[PDB]
A paper describes a structure:
Tc toxins consist of three components: TcA, TcB, and TcC. The ~1.4 MDa TcA is a homo-pentameric bell-shaped molecule that mediates target cell association, membrane penetration, and toxin translocation. TcA is made up of a central, pre-formed channel that is enclosed by an outer shell composed of a structurally conserved α-helical domain decorated with variable receptor-binding domains (RBDs). Cryo-EM structures of Mm-TcdA4 and Xn-XptA1 in complex with heparin reveal that the glycan interacts with different parts of the shell domain, including receptor-binding domains.
To address whether heparins/HS bind to a different region in other TcAs, we decided to determine the structure of a TcA from another organism in complex with heparin/HS. We chose Xn-XptA1, because it also shows a strong binding signal to porcine intestinal mucosa heparin. Expectedly, the obtained cryo-EM structure at 3.7 Å resolution is very similar to the structure of Xn-XptA1 without heparin, but clear densities corresponding to heparin/HS are present. However, their position differs from that in the Mm-TcdA4–heparin complex. Instead of interacting with the upper region of the shell, they are located in a gap between the neuraminidase-like domain, RBD B and RBD D. This binding pocket is not directly connected to the α-helical shell and is predominantly formed by polar and charged residues. In particular, a docked heparin oligosaccharide interacts with N1090, N1092, H1121, D1582, and S1584 of the neuraminidase-like domain, Y1548 and S1580 of RBD B and W1663, K1665, N1674, R1677, Q1678, and P1679 of RBD D. Since the RBDs of Tc toxins are not conserved, this binding pocket is not conserved as well. In the case of Xn-XptA1, the heparin/HS binding site is closer to the membrane (ca. 4 nm) and is located in a cleft between two RBDs and the neuraminidase-like domain. Taken together, our results show that the heparin/HS binding site is not conserved in different TcAs, although binding itself is.
Numbering used by the authors:
A (entry chain D): 2185 to 2232
B (entry chain E), C (entry chain D): 2088 to 2135
D (entry chain A): 1797 to 1990
E (entry chain A): 50 to 292
F (entry chain E): 244 to 631
G (entry chain A): 875 to 1068
H (entry chain E): 923 to 1019
Amino acid sequence: ASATRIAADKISQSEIYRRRRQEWEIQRNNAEAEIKQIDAQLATLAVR
Amino acid sequence: DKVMAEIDADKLALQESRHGAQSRFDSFNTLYDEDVNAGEKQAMDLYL
Amino acid sequence: DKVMAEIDADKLALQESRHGAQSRFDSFNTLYDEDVNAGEKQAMDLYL
Amino acid sequence: MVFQRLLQEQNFTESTRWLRYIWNPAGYSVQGEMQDYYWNVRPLEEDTSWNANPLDSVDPDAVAQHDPMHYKVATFMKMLDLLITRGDSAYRQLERDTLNEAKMWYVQALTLLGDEPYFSLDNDWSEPRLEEAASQTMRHHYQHKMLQLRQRAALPTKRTANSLTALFLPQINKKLQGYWQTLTQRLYNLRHNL
Amino acid sequence: YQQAHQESKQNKLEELRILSRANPQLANITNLNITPSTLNNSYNSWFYGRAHRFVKPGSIASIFSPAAYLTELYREAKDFHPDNSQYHLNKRRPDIASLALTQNNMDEEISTLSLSNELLLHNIQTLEKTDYNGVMKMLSTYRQTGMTPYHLPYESARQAILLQDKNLTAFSRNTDVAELMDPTSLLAIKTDISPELYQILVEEITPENSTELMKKNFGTDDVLIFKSYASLARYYDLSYDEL
Amino acid sequence: PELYQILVEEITPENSTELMKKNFGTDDVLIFKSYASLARYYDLSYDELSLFVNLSFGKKNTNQQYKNEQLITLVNDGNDTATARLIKRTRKDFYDSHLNYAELIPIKENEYKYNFSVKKTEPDHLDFRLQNGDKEYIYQDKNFVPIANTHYSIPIKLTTEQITNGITLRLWRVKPNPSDAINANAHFKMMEFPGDIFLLKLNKAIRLYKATGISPEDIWQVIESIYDDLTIDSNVLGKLFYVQYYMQHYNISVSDALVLCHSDISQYSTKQQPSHFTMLFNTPLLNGQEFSADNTKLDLTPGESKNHFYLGIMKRAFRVNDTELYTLWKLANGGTNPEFMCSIENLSLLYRVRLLADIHHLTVNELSMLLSVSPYVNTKIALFSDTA
Amino acid sequence: TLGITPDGVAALIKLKYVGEPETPMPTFDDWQAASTLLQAGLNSQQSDQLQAWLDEATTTAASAYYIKNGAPQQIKSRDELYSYLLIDNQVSAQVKTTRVAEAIASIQLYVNRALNNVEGKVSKPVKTRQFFCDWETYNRRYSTWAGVSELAYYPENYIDPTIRIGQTGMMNNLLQQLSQSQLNIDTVEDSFKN
Amino acid sequence: QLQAWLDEATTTAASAYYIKNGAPQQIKSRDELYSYLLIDNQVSAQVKTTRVAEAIASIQLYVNRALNNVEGKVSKPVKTRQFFCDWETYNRRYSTW
């Protein structure tokens, strides 16, 4: 029972690491959209 | 003419904001559609 | 002339926003490219 | 199970090894010489009835145990999954050396698949009424014909009219068609600069 | 029962074993050593080319099509009632038995309530043995039930006028042609008063004309024809508050 | 230039075997033997190949053999020439209102088989008749009710002249009571060629489809608008240029350019898309009953019609008033109103003038003004050539 | 502002309800002529709007007439007419549904009403077939029915290498030993030796 | 733009002519011509690749087609060298090699 308890802890740690990576992926996509938007704002500022 | 081109570049900036908002919505939707992961459900069953 | 100089300083402000958006994107990308750390993988192996 | 888990954790060079432990299309090198087979499991080579009475409950594992050809087909679909995800992981990196690798994986999947069944389909249907199609007499006659098929019935050679005209037709499975569609979409995007 | 069930199970198993190796997708695949089940010729000779005939996914002819689902549904559901019972499927809905299982009926997206209208008008035509125009003529003048008469050209005309000139501002502008228009006719334009409904509203009720007009507007005499608030509200489609 | 030489050359029975060598190489007409080899040779899809070729292969498993309302039926033993018989259904009046399909299939020479299926059966008529353009009842079986959604087969004896000219079979259900006889008619027209000339014509038709990207029914319509017997020529290529140029010039549709390029309103329907005729006239069905292009006289003066069905249908289909319709018909005949027959040949060139007003963003009164100040004041638009 | 001719305006005024004497009553064909006169004067948007409104009016006319004249005696409301005819006569005309889906919904409503014995006399021996023992879970909707029939025909689509009904304790312990985010070759070989 | 369009037209001219006139008899489609010649004739002209990478991709396609025995007659003793025992993991791509 102790061995399968600590196996549950191991798989829980693996899944929380996977969720941390997915959240970092969200943040990276948001920042890439942001840098594209500010680049296009630089373009319209040059036109103005 | 240059005023109209500024309007066009501003529309391009708005599209590039909308693309990242779309990707964030799709990523959160595919996160929400799977409540538990395979490993998360495995850890629940191991605790049980 | 002063109106045009105001446009120039606004472009400088936009560049300084874009630099920080770039640094945030690069930091999140180098966070995402390593899923687990060396210590995190070590802790997984120790639980196993 | 090990290969599926290595695919989900994306250890590709080990997942393909653990798939080589069961299926290799390139044959097997045993004591330096090649072999005459491609399936490393003998009840997959010779279809052994693992499970008599499989339809007592709804279990795809029970039906695939009743004949292991379905296990063989699912193994091939897992191989196609591995190849197209190698191609997708190569395609998402967006370098022109990796695009050749992605086209290599998609070409390898396509030449494992072969030719898509295009003109061999029917597109041919004598449309009955619902009253004709739900004929319990016709359905019973069809089952009686099936029992005559397994009892071999001497094949009476009396060429009569096809009383089973309103029978619905067999359908090819959706997943292989999805594989064909995504492979030709990948190669269309790769053969342009998309 | 157990032996017949076992026979049906093994017939389904043999059919599955025949058809699952005659798949056209699994022909040109490299190094998948699959032989046909040595009864494929027997299947094609018994059923004339059925294993030879595989169908496209998403077709009307497919065994997983909604037509196949409907066929199995009707074949298993047409026996809940005795045949002479008025709740039997073919007796309550003879249209659903003779539906042609075609790709047009499968994929042609018609609006519902058009099927309901065609079904009701076809049942009224089959009942009264007349044409559609005759049904509309009799429905434009039927006075016995509530929510009826229904003058369909009048309804088409008043909805066309309400779509073109909402709120009747042409009546307010062009007063010299508004002189020619009747106020009750403009009432019939702005809200629904059929010509038969106007004849119902405009007729006077004498003690002499009482029993005849009660036949003309209700049918039966003998004043206790509703007997309850519920029957009255159901006959006129009223709420308890409106009643 | 070589493709133009391929398209412009004529195919005689004398020049057949030589031109088959010049355009294919090998003789002996069975050079494709399969749909897959044809589609591979011409780089066609099965759908694009289905626009042209609909053979007798797989006959027994269907009751409808016509694909895109056409059917080729090649017969053997024609002195080993393998002559083909292309038959095109045309879907005339009351087709969609009273029946599912209605196909005329040749069995042998002067031996034809009528396949149909009555939708919404009528129990109170029982008098099956079958005439051709109201001339003579070909098949007539009193006391027979075709029940709903059932594929019936009726043998029909038809002469080669009557089938090579466009025939219009008319399915009747008359009642012995003197009330209404339900009319439902479709139009057929067969075309017969020897195999080599058929292959060469199909070759240049498929090459023109590959070159232009235009519809095969559309090239049928433009070749029918000028010539007969399907001879691709320089006038056909000019009209095929002009439909494309008008379709790019204005934002009109294909059939909308067809009406402008001296063709008629197309009655070709499909299960994909309805006919342009029923789209224009009967898609929002006016009084339930549909509009049928009958030769019924109707005086278009704004007070003497009293046939409000066709009048309202024309006014809604042309988006026009009574007076504006009358002056539209007056422009079509040079300020006169001889007689309106309500035929398809009048509905086209009544629609041509409306399109002429609309594509230049003019009202019909403005078009009448501009033609009144033109050098085209009292000219006959009904009697124009395509160049005029 | 009505989009017609002044003679059409005079024809509309000649349909006066109460006007001058010695003018005859407006006939039904006269009303139909005025109706198509006004109906030809609309564009496609107003034509679709008018057509939808006319359908939604003629349904509540014809249903009341059918309830009054020809129906079984138990039918007294529009909901009872729906419960009989298995097609909803109260749906506004924005809803679209093909004929086979309407027939499927009608037969499914008939089955769900017959199973609860709301009808006259349900034949109880027909109620206990295997198709109706599996009604509540599989056969009620087309999606689950097609999923069960696909699981019968192509079980290769539904087998996953991870879970299986009847897998052993050593297999489950291997799956516990194998379910991490990181799987080395040494880790999977130690798990395989275990 | 004109040059790219003319190249993308002359490839689908010349490939059909090569399939018709001079080719082994098994070649009947453009995909079969690709599978023979090991160079893709359907790629639009925006894609750039040097000659050594084209030759590398051609030989790698030839090896991956010969290992699955899709060709006529694969010499089975050549198939079991150490270089092809390490083909699946190392020698398939230049980076891992």
